Paper text:
The protein was crystallized, and its structure was solved at 2.39 Å. The helices (α1–α5) span residues 12–25, 29–36, 40–48, 54–67, and 69–85. Electrostatic analysis showed predominantly positive charges. This analysis revealed that Q9, P10, and G11, belonging to the N‐terminal loop, as well as F72, Y76, and R79 in the last helix α5, are completely conserved, along with several conserved glycine residues in the middle. The long N‐terminal loop, impeding dimer formation, is a distinctive feature of AcrVIA6 and contributes to its binding to dsDNA as a monomer. Therefore, AcrVIA6 is a dsDNA‐binding protein that uses the HTH motif, comprising α2 and α3, to bind dsDNA. Using an in vitro Cas13a activity assay, we confirmed that AcrVIA6 fails to inhibit RNA cleavage, even at high concentrations.
Anti‐CRISPR (Acr) proteins, which are naturally occurring inhibitors of CRISPR‐Cas systems, have evolved as a counterdefense mechanism employed by bacteriophages and other mobile genetic elements. The AcrVIA6 protein, which targets the type VI‐A CRISPR‐Cas system, has been identified as a potent Cas13a inhibitor. While an initial study suggested that AcrIVA6 is a true anti‐CRISPR protein, another study argued that AcrIVA6 might not be an anti‐CRISPR due to its inability to inhibit Cas13 activity in an in vivo system. This study reveals that AcrVIA6 functions as a DNA‐binding protein rather than a Cas13a inhibitor, as it does not block RNA cleavage.
Residue numbers in the entry: 4 to 88
The structure:
Amino acid sequence: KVKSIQPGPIFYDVFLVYLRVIGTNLKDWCAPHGVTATNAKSAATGGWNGTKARALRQKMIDEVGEETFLRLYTERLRREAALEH
């Protein structure tokens, strides 16, 4: 059906590439949050799932629009599933 936004590889790429669309990068996005790029990826992929990681994941979603994040994330998943079938 439709999926809600979950962490993982696609979450991380959609956020990473969104920063590119609006012309920042991971490095410069991370700094005002007092966090590392490496910590940003771990939270985004769901590898770190502590509640501090959730707070950061929510900032990534609010950076994109929540609706825009869902649309990018959803259409991307559709394309992978299409190659897997």
